[PDB]
Design an enzyme around this catalytic site. Structure first.
Site, PDB file in Angstrom:
ATOM      1  CB  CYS A  74      -0.909  -0.052   1.141  1.00 42.56           C
ATOM      2  SG  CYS A  74      -0.470   0.353   2.725  1.00 42.56           S
ATOM      3  CG  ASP A  92      -2.864  23.441  -8.597  1.00 40.81           C
ATOM      4  OD1 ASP A  92      -3.431  22.698  -9.373  1.00 40.81           O
ATOM      5  OD2 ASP A  92      -3.098  24.595  -8.557  1.00 40.81           O
ATOM      6  CG  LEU A 128       0.364  20.654 -16.350  1.00 46.09           C
ATOM      7  CD1 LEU A 128       0.580  21.142 -17.640  1.00 46.09           C
ATOM      8  CD2 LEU A 128      -0.905  20.126 -16.410  1.00 46.09           C
ATOM      9  CG  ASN A 183      -4.833   2.804   3.366  1.00 45.72           C
ATOM     10  OD1 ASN A 183      -5.486   3.099   4.147  1.00 45.72           O
ATOM     11  ND2 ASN A 183      -4.557   1.282   3.243  1.00 45.72           N
ATOM     12  CB  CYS A 202       1.645   1.561   6.340  1.00 45.02           C
ATOM     13  SG  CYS A 202       2.224   1.681   8.138  1.00 45.02           S
ATOM     14  CE1 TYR A 208     -15.233  -1.155   0.531  1.00 42.52           C
ATOM     15  CE2 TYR A 208     -15.207  -3.123   2.006  1.00 42.52           C
ATOM     16  CZ  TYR A 208     -14.690  -2.422   0.971  1.00 42.52           C
ATOM     17  OH  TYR A 208     -13.884  -3.285  -0.092  1.00 42.52           O
TER      18      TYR A 208
END
EC number: 1.17.4.1
Lengths: 728, 16, 578, 16, 146
Positions: C72, C79, C81, C278, C303, C572
Site C-alpha cells: 500500500c 497543483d 503538471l 490509503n 506502510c 464502506y
C-alpha cells in the site's frame, strides 16, 4: 457524566434512575417484557447533550421495536411511554390540569368551542372532572396512541404541539353531544357516554372524534348524490361534490340516469364521469392522493361494456376514468339471463319510460317493461350474451378489485324504505350505506336530496354479554341523533336528507376476535347461529333506543315513508333462503316492539350499517369490522418507525383465530354476511377473497367467481365490495 | 390472472 | 497464494512450515549470532501457531529472489503538471507490483481558474494509471482518491461513480475519500451554508484545514466575507445529503475527519501533517508532493503491516513478547525490501512507520460474552487496546535503545512527550470507565529519553486472507453469518466461524445489530490508542426501516456519532438485500 | 433506496 | 482565431495588417540591418496578399508575450514502464499547449509476454494523457497512435 438539554434549553447531569423508574412504571402488570433490554437498546443511542424530548422518543421507539407475537405486551409498554411523553408535552407534567382550568385556557386559545363554557357552569365542569379516569390512558396499545397523536388529539398542525389528552377528548365529546339535554338527565348521560367510549365499548368516526368540541361543525364524512339526466343536474352534482370533498367526505354517485352516447349526452356518459373525477380530486394534494368516490349505474345501460373497463389501464385516455371506483347494479332478471344462458338487452335510460324506476322499486313491473321493450324494435337497443357481460364485469372486478356489485332488488324488498315513495338507488364509497336520494336542479335546489350517514360501531370484544347492548344502543343512538342537530350542512339537499329521515349507521368492530373467543370460525358454518343470535340483539336494541326516543322527542319528519311505519320489520322481509342455514330462534319480543313502533314510530329511519374500519379499531385494539385478520401482527409504516399491532389476546387465541387466507373459500363468510343482513337496515361492506395458489396453475376460474356472486345473491347479500387477491 | 371458462349448464342448476 | 509454486506448471515446491521458518530466517538474517536463532525460533512459533498474521506479499515472497513487498502506498499530488505526471508515473510503477494506492488530489485547482479545465480529466488519468497493469483495464489495481469537502468542484466530484451521467462526468473505478472538519459539520448542524473555494484562490487555507483548526476558522470566514474571491455557496444539508446519497448507493464514498487525524496523532501537524489515507482508510501518514518521479524532496508514505490474533493469545500480557516479535520483524523488513521510487524510500527510512492491528476480535468478544451493539464491550475494548498500544510502544522503545530512534523522530508528537492517552477525543470518557493498567508515565519518560524506532506502530486494517489462514473472524468485523461460502474452481469453499459449537449464541452476527451506535463506540474506544486509523464500516438493513428505505436523518446521525467519538475515517457502507 | 428527509432542528441539538 | 483581443471583455485591439507586419518583424528580428527591413517588407507582402499561409498558433501568437507555437509533436514509446511514463508525461505537457500528438506505441509487448497485461491498458493511459486538458475529458486535444 453525560449532559442533557432540558424541556426549555440548557444542560444538567444525566439521571439514569429517573428513566428506569418511568420504565418500571410503564411495565407494571405486563408480561414477557424486559426493561433491561429496552435500556440497552436506548442508552447506546444517547450522547452528551441530548435534547430531553429525544430521550423519550428513543425509549418509546426502543420499546416499540420489540413488539412481537411472542412478546405482545411491548404494545402497552411503548404506549404508556408515549402517553407519559404526551402528557409532559401537553401539560408540562404527568398530571393533567383540572377540567375547567383546561377548558377555559383552550377556549381562550381558539382551540375549543366557546359554547362549552356557555352550556356548563364551573361546578358542572368540577363534576365532570370526577367522571374522568386518566389511568384509562394506560389501557391503549402503541398503535392506538400513534392514531390519537396522528389524527384525534387537538394539536397545532404547523408547530406540532399537542394541547390535550385522550380523556379530555372523550369527556368533552360527551359534553357537546348532550349539551342540549335538561339538567335533570344531562350529566348522567355525559358520564355514561364517557365511560362507554373511554372503555372502548363504542367507537366513533375520525371527524367526530377530532372535531366535536372544537370551533368546527363539519362532521359529515360520507355523502350520497343522485344525478338527473340534464346539464343542470350534472352541474348541481358536480358542485355538490366539490363542496363535499373540500371537507374530505367520501362520495357515492348514482349516474346511471345519464343518457347513452348517440342519443337525441349526444356524446354520452364517459366525458361526464371524467368531470366527476376531477370534481372529486379538486381538493387533492396533487390531483391524486385523497378524495374518493364510487360511481353507480345499471348493468343494462347501453354503454355498460365501456363502463366496465373504465379503470383498466390498457386503453387510450378518453376511454378511461381510473381514479374512481364503480358499482354495477344488478337484479334477479339479470342473473336469470346468466343462468338460463340467454341474452341481456342494453338500453339507454332515456329511451325506455318507467324502466329505470321499476329496476329498483318493482321487480315484476321491471319484468313487464323490459320484455315489452325487448319485443318493441323501434327502440334503440344492443344485445349481449349474459355470460360474456358477467365475464367482463368479473374480469375487471378481479384485476382491479374495485368494481363492486349492488343487488338493487334486495335493497328495496328488504329495506326500511317503501320503494314506491323513497327507493334505494345507490350506495356510498364503501357499499354499506343505502338510503333514498333525489337528483338536484341546482346546488341550492331545496327539492333535491343528498343522503348523509352518521356512523358508529359497537366493539364486540368489550361487551361481556349481549344484554349490555341496550344501554349502549341508548347511548349510541342518542349521541348520534344529537349530532345531526349539531353539525352544519353546506348544501340544502343534504340538510333535507338528514332532518327528514334522521338516518344512522351503527355497526360492529372486533367480530373476528368475538368469534375466536366463542370458538367459532368463518369458513365452516359453525358461527351461523351465534351470528343470528348476535345481530338480532344488535338490531332489536337499536330499534328499542330509537323507539324510546320517538316517545321522548317525536318520530323523524319523514317517518311515514319507512316500511316501519306500515308495521313491517326486517324479520318480515329477509331473503327466505336464510332459513336453510341457521335455526336460531328469535329471543326478543319483536311483536311488543312491532306494536310500540306502529304507535310511537322511530326517531331515525335507519339505525344499522356495517362499515369497514381501520382507525377506530386500531384505537381500541380490535379486529377491523367484520373482517378476519390477514395475519397475527399488523405492520404499518410512519416516519416514527415501523408500527406493529398484535391481534387482541393472541396468547390465548392464536388457534382460535381463522386468519383470512386460511379460508378454503368464500361460502362460510358469505353466509355470515347473509345472516347479518337479515337484521341490518342498510348494507354491509362485504369482501370476496381469493388465493391463486389454491387453484390449478394459480388461476382463479371464472366459474368460481360467478358461483360466489350467485351465492351472495342467494343469501340476500345487498352489496359486494372489494375483491382481494393474495400474492405469493 | 383468471381462467375464462364458463359452463352455462353447470350454472343453470342454481336456484336464485 | 502463499506456497512457492510453479505458476505455469502448477507444481508446489514447499510446505507451510518451511514458509514459516524461512520468513523468520530472512527478517532476522542480519542479527548477531548471540541473539539471531532464538529470534528465528520465537517468530516461527508465533506465526506457525497463528499468534501473528502477516500480509500476502511478505508471506509469499520473503525467502524468494524478489524484494517487492510494499502493498500500500500514499501519494500526494501538487497543483502542477509536473506533479501530476510525477504522481501518475509513481502510480504506474506501484500498480505494476500490485500495490493499493491512496491519492490526495485536493490541491489541484478547480475548473475555470487562471486546470483551466480542472479536476476530472486528471482523475481519469490517475484511473488509467491505476488500471495500467490490470488484466483488461478492469480487474485488479485499486485506488482511493482524496479531496476536501469545500473544493469548488465538490458537487461534480461526489457523483463521480454514479452511473447515470455521460462519460466525461464519471470516473467509476476508483473510490473516493471526502475530507471533513468541525467547521463543516457545524454548518450542517446550525443549518447554514458551506462556501466552496478552489484551493488555488485561498492562500494558507488548505494547509490550515489539516494543521490548524482556528486558523482555518479565521481564513475561511475572511475569504467568505472577501468577495473579490471566486466562490460558490451551497446549503450544508444538501451537500451532506448528496455525499451520503452517493455513499449509500455505491457504498464507497468514504469520510475522513482531517482535524481528528491531526489533533489526535503521532505527528506534529506543523512539520508533518496527515493529509490523506490509503485504499482502505486505516493508514494515516505524512506525504509531500513530487516534482518528478525521482524527486528526492517528495515523500510517499508506505506502510508495513501485521496483526495480532486475539483468539490465539490466552491473556493480554502475551502481547509483550508478540509486540517485540512483530515490531522487530517488520522493522527489519523496512531495511530488506527494495524501493522503486526515491520519495518512498524517504518516507520509509525517515519515519520507519508500521501498521500492526488485530484479527479475530469478534470471536474474542464472543468468548468473553460481550456484544457489539449494546455497550457491553466498551471497557473490555479499552482494556484490550491499551495493552496492544502500550506493548507496541514498549517494543519500539526497547529497539530505539538497541538501534537508535528513527531519523525523523523529532517530528512526532511523541518526541515532544505527548502520548495518544493525552490527545484522544474527550467524549470517550462518557462511554467507558476502564482505568489504565500500565505505567504510561514510566514509558512517557523512557520515550522522551530514548525515542521510538518507528513513528507509528498501530493501524487496524481489514483482513480476508490472513484471517482465513488462522481461521479467524476478519479484522474487527462481526461475521455476516456462521458459515462463509467462497467459490474456487476446486468446488464450493466453506469456513465455519471458530468454535461455533460452544459460541453460536455468544456471537452477534452483523445483521443482528439494531444499528451502528455500539460498533461506532468501539471504534472510538479503539482509536484512543491507535496511532493511525481504523477501517470502520457503517451497516444498514433496509427491512429495519419504514417501507424499506434508510432515512437520511439516520445516515447523518451515525456520521455525527462517529465524529463525536473521535473516529478518524469511515470506510464502506454495507447495505443488506433481502 | 434512501429517504431524503432532513430535519435541521433535530440535528442542531447534537454537540460535536 | 487571429486578432489579439480580450478573452473576457471581447475587446479587439488590432487589425489584420498589424498582425501581418508584426509577425514579419518578429520572425526576421535577428537579421542584420543590411537586409532585415527588406525581408520584413517582402514577407509582409507575401502573407497579406495570400501567397504564403501560416498555421493558427503562429498567426495568433507571434508578436505576443508567448513562445508556444508548436502545433504538432511525434513521440515514440519504448517497451518499458519508464518510457510509458515519459511518453505520457510528454503528451500531457504538449496537449496543455494544444498540440496534436502522433504516438508510436508499436514496441509495447503483447498480452501474455513474460506489458504482460497488454497494450490496451497503456493505450487507455495515453488517451487520458491526450485528454487531460480539455472540456470534461472529451473535447479538444487529439492523437493518432501507430
Amino acid at each position: 457524566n453525560l449532559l442533557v438539554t432540558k424541556r426549555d434549553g440548557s444542560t444538567e447531569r444525566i439521571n439514569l434512575d429517573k428513566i428506569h423508574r418511568v420504565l418500571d412504571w410503564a411495565a407494571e402488570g405486563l408480561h414477557n417484557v424486559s426493561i433491561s433490554q429496552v435500556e440497552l437498546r436506548s442508552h447506546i443511542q444517547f450522547y452528551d447533550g441530548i435534547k430531553t424530548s429525544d430521550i423519550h422518543e428513543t425509549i418509546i421507539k426502543a420499546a416499540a421495536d420489540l413488539i412481537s407475537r411472542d412478546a405482545p405486551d411491548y404494545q402497552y409498554l411503548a404506549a404508556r411511554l408515549a402517553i407519559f411523553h404526551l402528557r409532559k408535552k401537553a401539560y408540562g407534567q404527568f398530571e393533567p390540569p383540572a377540567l375547567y382550568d383546561h377548558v377555559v385556557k383552550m377556549v381562550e386559545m381558539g382551540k375549543y368551542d366557546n359554547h362549552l363554557l356557555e352550556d356548563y357552569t364551573e361546578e358542572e365542569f368540577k363534576q365532570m372532572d370526577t367522571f374522568i379516569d386518566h389511568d384509562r390512558d394506560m389501557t391503549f396499545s402503541y398503535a392506538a396512541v400513534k392514531q390519537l397523536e396522528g389524527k384525534y388529539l387537538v394539536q397545532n398542525r404547523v408547530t406540532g404541539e399537542i394541547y390535550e389528552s385522550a380523556q379530555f377528548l372523550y369527556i368533552l365529546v360527551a359534553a357537546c353531544l348532550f349539551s342540549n339535554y335538561p339538567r335533570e338527565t344531562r350529566l348522567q348521560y355525559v358520564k355514561r357516554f364517557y365511560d362507554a367510549v373511554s372503555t372502548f365499548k363504542i367507537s366513533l368516526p375520525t371527524p367526530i372524534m377530532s372535531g366535536v368540541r372544537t370551533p368546527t361543525r363539519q362532521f359529515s364524512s360520507c355523502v350520497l348524490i343522485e344525478c338527473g339526466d340534464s346539464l343542470d343536474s350534472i352541474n348541481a352534482t358536480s358542485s355538490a361534490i366539490v363542496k363535499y370533498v373540500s371537507q374530505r367526505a367520501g362520495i357515492g354517485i348514482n349516474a346511471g340516469r345519464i343518457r347513452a352516447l348517440g342519443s337525441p349526452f349526444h356524446t354520452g356518459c364517459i366525458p361526464f364521469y371524467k368531470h366527476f373525477q376531477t370534481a372529486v380530486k379538486s381538493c387533492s394534494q396533487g390531483g391524486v392522493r385523497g378524495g374518493a368516490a364510487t360511481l353507480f349505474y345499471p348493468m343494462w345501460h347501453l354503454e355498460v361494456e365501456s363502463l366496465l373497463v373504465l379503470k383498466n389501464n390498457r386503453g387510450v385516455e378518453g376511454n378511461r376514468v381510473r381514479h374512481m371506483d364503480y358499482g354495477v347494479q344488478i337484479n334477479k332478471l339479470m342473473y336469470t339471463r346468466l343462468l338460463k344462458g340467454e341474452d341481456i338487452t342494453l338500453f339507454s335510460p332515456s329511451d325506455v319510460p318507467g324502466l329505470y324506476d321499476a329496476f329498483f322499486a318493482d321487480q315484476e313491473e321491471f319484468e313487464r317493461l323490459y320484455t315489452k321493450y325487448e319485443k318493441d324494435d323501434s327502440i334503440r337497443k344492443q344485445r349481449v350474451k349474459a355470460v360474456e357481460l358477467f365475464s367482463l364485469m368479473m374480469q375487471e372486478r378481479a384485476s382491479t378489485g374495485r368494481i363492486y356489485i349492488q343487488n338493487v332488488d334486495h335493497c328495496n324488498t328488504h329495506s326500511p324504505f317503501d320503494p314506491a315513495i323513497a327507493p334505494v338507488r345507490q350506495s356510498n364509497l364503501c357499499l354499506e350505506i343505502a338510503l333514498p336520494t333525489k337528483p338536484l336542479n341546482d346546488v341550492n335546489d331545496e327539492n333535491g336530496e343528498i343522503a348523509l350517514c352518521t356512523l358508529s360501531a359497537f366493539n364486540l370484544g368489550a361487551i361481556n354479554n349481549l344484554d349490555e347492548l341496550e344501554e349502549l344502543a341508548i347511548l349510541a343512538v342518542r349521541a348520534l341523533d344529537a349530532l345531526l342537530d349539531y353539525q352544519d350542512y353546506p348544501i340544502p339537499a343534504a340538510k333535507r336528507g338528514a332532518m327528514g329521515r334522521r338516518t344512522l349507521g351503527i355497526g360492529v368492530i372486533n367480530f373476528a376476535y368475538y368469534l375466536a373467543k366463542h370458538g367459532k370460525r368463518y369458513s365452516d358454518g359453525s358461527a351461523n347461529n351465534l351470528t343470528h343470535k348476535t345481530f338480532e340483539a344488535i338490531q332489536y336494541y337499536l330499534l328499542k333506543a330509537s323507539n324510546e326516543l320517538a316517545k321522548e322527542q317525536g318520530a323523524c319528519p319523514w317517518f311515514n315513508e319507512t316500511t316501519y311505519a306500515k308495521g313491517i320489520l326486517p324479520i318480515d322481509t329477509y331473503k327466505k333462503d336464510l332459513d336453510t342455514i341457521a335455526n336460531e330462534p328469535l329471543h326478543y319480543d319483536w311483536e311488543a316492539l312491532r306494536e310500540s313502533i306502529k304507535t310511537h314510530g322511530l326517531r331515525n329511519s335507519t339505525l344499522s350499517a356495517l362499515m369497514p374500519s381501520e382507525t377506530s379499531s386500531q384505537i381500541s385494539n380490535a379486529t377491523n369490522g367484520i373482517e378476519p385478520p390477514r395475519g397475527y401482527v399488523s405492520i404499518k409504516a410512519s416516519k416514527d418507525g415501523i408500527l406493529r399491532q398484535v391481534v387482541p389476546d393472541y396468547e390465548h387465541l392464536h388457534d382460535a383465530y381463522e386468519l383470512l387466507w386460511e379460508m378454503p373459500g368464500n361460502d362460510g363468510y358469505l353466509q355470515l354476511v347473509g345472516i347479518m343482513q337479515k337484521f341490518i337496515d342498510q348494507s354491509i361492506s362485504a369482501n370476496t377473497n381469493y388465493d391463486p395458489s389454491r387453484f390449478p396453475s394459480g388461476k382463479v376460474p371464472m366459474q368460481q367467481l360467478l358461483k360466489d356472486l350467485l351465492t351472495a345473491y342467494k343469501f340476500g347479500v345487498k352489496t359486494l365490495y372489494y375483491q382481494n387477491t393474495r400474492d405469493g | 390472472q383468471i381462467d375464462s371458462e364458463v359452463d352455462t349448464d353447470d350454472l343453470s342448476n342454481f336456484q336464485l
